[PDB]
């Protein structure tokens, strides 16, 4: 059972003018659960937000909704705010504790994120595929999502550099299958 906490950040993000095109699934590269991010970031100063803030933060049993992606953008892919940026077009969710959690716990954090994404896709009328389910590294060259990639592909972008398209697709296809599973029930 998944708790969703609607507790919006202390700042107002620009309107998009349309529903999200899909979901970018990030890893937080961090050490906090969804609740811990909420506790520290829901009511915070702009100095914290200016360093980046995604729409959603998920871990086992819990998703914090920082920004309603339905009509508002977020700062998650680092490619500016133009109409072709991931920030403008895509909702962003972080799988939390991607450094601190054990493999078993992190994999459960991922499943909470897939189930939530599935719920969003139903609301926004989207079908999961390589166009609607995305990686941060497709927008700017980074090693995110580092933990998901190493567990699901065996390739570690932290130590091995940029992965090939086939490695990226192996990971996206895994995300897509699971989101599809939850949408089907
Ligand atoms: Zn629309
Ligand atoms: Zn990312
Ligand atoms: Zn610690
Ligand atoms: Zn451990």
Strands 3-6 and 62-65: parallel
Ligand in closest contact with the CA of 135: 2
Among 102, 33, 89, 19, smallest CA distance to 62 is for: 33
Domain locations along the chain = 1-185
Rounded to the nearest angstrom, the distance between the alpha carbon of 147 and the centre of ligand 2 is 11
CATH topology for the 1-185 domain: Lysozyme-like (3.40.80)
Ligand-binding site membership of 136 (annotated): yes
Tell whether omega for the bond before 145 is within 30 degrees of 0, i.e. cis: yes
DSSP for the chain reads: --EEEE---SS-PPB-SS--S-EEEEE--SS--HHHHHHHHTT--HHHHHT-B-SEEEETTEEEESS-TTTB--B-S-S-SSTTSHHHH-EEEEES-TTTS-HHHHHHHHHHHHHHHHHHHHHHT---STTTEE-GGGTSS---SHHHHHHHHS--HHHH-SPPHHHHHHHHHHHHHHHHHHHH-
Token pair 């500016």: residue: 80
CA dihedral (130, 103, 116, 10) positive or negative: negative
Tokens 């992965």 appear where?
163
26 is in an annotated binding site: yes
90 Cα to the center of ligand 2, angstroms: 12
Distances (CA, A) of 73 to 11, 39, 185: 12, 21, 29
108 and 20 in contact (C-beta within 8 Å)? no
Contact 174, 157 (CB under 8 A): no
Listed resolution, Å: 2.3
* Residues 171 and 135: beta-carbon distance below 8 Å: yes
- Ligand that comes closest to the CA of residue 30: 3
- Give distance in angstroms: CA of 109 to centre of ligand 4: 14
From the CA of 124, the nearest ligand is 1
Q: Is 89 left (phi over 0), alpha (psi -120 to 50) or beta?
A: alpha
Which one of the ligands is nearest to 125 CA? 1
Q: What technique was this entry resolved by?
A: X-ray
Question: Is 96 annotated as contributing to ligand binding?
Answer: no
Q: Which of 2, 164, 154, 161 is nearest to 93 (CA)?
A: 2
């Amino acid at each position: 059972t998944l708790k969703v906490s609607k507790n919006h950040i202390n700042y107002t993000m620009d309107k998009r003018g349309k529903k999200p095109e899909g979901m970018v699934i990030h890893n937080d590269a961090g050490r906090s659960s969804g609740q811990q991010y909420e506790n520290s970031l829901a009511n915070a100063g702009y100095a914290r937000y200016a360093n980046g803030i995604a729409h959603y933060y998920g871990s086992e049993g819990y998703v914090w909704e920082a920004i309603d992606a339905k009509n508002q953008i977020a700062w998650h892919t680092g490619d500016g705010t133009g109409a072709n940026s991931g920030n403008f077009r895509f909702a962003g969710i972080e799988v939390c504790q991607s450094m601190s959690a054990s493999d078993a716990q992190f994999l459960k954090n991922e499943q909470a994120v897939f189930q939530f994404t599935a719920e969003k896709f139903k609301e926004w009328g989207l079908t999961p595929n390589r166009k609607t389910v995305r990686l941060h590294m497709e927008f700017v060259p980074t090693a995110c999502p580092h933990r998901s990639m190493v567990l699901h592909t065996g390739f570690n972008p932290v130590t091995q550099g940029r992965p090939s398209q086939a490695i990226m697709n192996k990971l996206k296809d895994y995300f897509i299958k699971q989101i599809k599973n939850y949408m089907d029930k």
